[model samples]
Target: DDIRQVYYRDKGISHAKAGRYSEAVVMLEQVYDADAFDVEVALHLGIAYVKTGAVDRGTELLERSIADAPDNIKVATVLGLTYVQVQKYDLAVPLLVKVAEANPVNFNVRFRLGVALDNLGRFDEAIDSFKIALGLRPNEGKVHRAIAYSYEQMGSHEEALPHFKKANELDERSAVELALV
Candidate 1:
């Protein structure tokens, strides 16, 4: 806990910002353990946890981080993506939409936002999100499948057909599945 004193903030904050993730975790944890209420340190340390594959722990930290700093879009984006990866779509969808609304260009998040929607039977919204992803990566087989699946859910079999065919063309593994369609 002594490590949480003012001096380590420079090192921890700097290392995480610098992207030397391993080193940052060492420093960030020290500061975070000492003062759990610090939103900024919680944010930086929280991210360090994610980058280092401690997503479960990081997810908890980020939950509080955003709660304490509701205006932090950065924390919202990171936490939303974390929720998606962990398959907590209910939590992810709301936070993700907030970020996507601010800026929609990130292909990964867009695709994930679609997935979160689709998982919850929100097929219409998923279709829109998937199409946005398609705009970023038109030829990607996964996006094609995602879009096709969303359409299929909406009973748009005819609309789904083209994407199913494209997905099959792009990924040979999808051929058998496509045939059944």
Candidate 2:
């Protein structure tokens, strides 16, 4: 059983690295209870849980792993995303800001940071982050839509119009929804 457990754990981590989240979740779940104190295992399992839609449980596991290794980017990123899942934007913002600073070219991190900022009522900062992400991935409809939404949030309807139209031209449904707002 011990040897088999190690095999399962190793296989689970491998699956996670390969982005086979469902398979990783199954394999990791088998050992997670027994290896709850293992930061690496917990980190992988936590991400797997989130990928597999067990976000609440994943959040708990990721938070625990972060406590053990706060500077670990993988854990911090996952924890930041988990905070977003639970609508804890205030909690997500600072962590995401740190992650964005470390990974300036990561469009996902920048976009998510913008989301957290927008939710926290920091529309100007959100627009700045969204613009950075847009620079990284030009013509991204979602980023355009995000920028437009932030402008709308700040009550700058005129400033928001061009972004909303640009997002519409880029063919995103959300922009269509925001056009009237």
Candidate 3:
């Protein structure tokens, strides 16, 4: 039974990663309820729920997992990301910010925090977040792309140029027409 549960749980995650979200949700939701404290099941179920547009339920499960496993950095990151997906940036920022502070090496937290802050119109702070993320993962053009967008939003095209250049250099695809620029 334990091994069967693991098999289904792994299949659920594979389905989710393949974008078969509804099927993933059905499998993961069953495994998660059957083994309520199984961390992997909880994570997979939360992801599946959100992928199916059930953000509120996903948020609850992820949050519960976070609360129950404070030491689980992965869980915290996933939960924070789920909040961002649901447009709950206010809730996401603090959680991600804490993780970013605690594990300065977690580039994803910094990058995602910047993305959330940018969405909230906190441009300056968002820029700082992206910069930190860039320092950690220099080759990633996504952070630079975000910095460029934030600068352009503020009509600081001059300031945005370096980041845009960096983004284009890394991946010409990043230079795709952003807005009226």
Off by over 4 Å in 2: 1-5, 19-26, 33-36, 172-181
How close is every model to the real structure, measured as TM-score?
0.82, 0.80, 0.67
What lDDT does the true structure give each of the candidates?
0.86, 0.86, 0.84
Give the clash count for each candidate.
0, 0, 0
lDDT by residue (tens digit), candidate 1, 27-133: 77766753458887888888888899998888899998888888688898899998988889999988888888777787888889999999999999899999898
Model 2 clash number: 0
For residue 86, what is the lDDT in candidate 1?
A: 87
lDDT of 3 by residue, 1-181 (tens): 8897788888998897788889999888657763458766677778778778888888788887877777677778878887786788988998898889789998988888998999999999999999999999887887788999999998999999998898878775444545436
What lDDT would candidate 2 get against the real structure?
Answer: 0.86
Question: In lDDT terms, how accurate is model 3?
Answer: 0.84
Candidate 3 runs further than 4 Å off? 1-44, 51-53, 68-71, 173-181
* Model 2 deviation from the true structure expressed as Cα RMSD, one decimal place: 4.9
| Highest TM-score against the true fold, candidate | 1
lDDT per residue for candidate 2 within 37-83, as digits (tens), equals: 77888999888888888888888888888888888887888888778
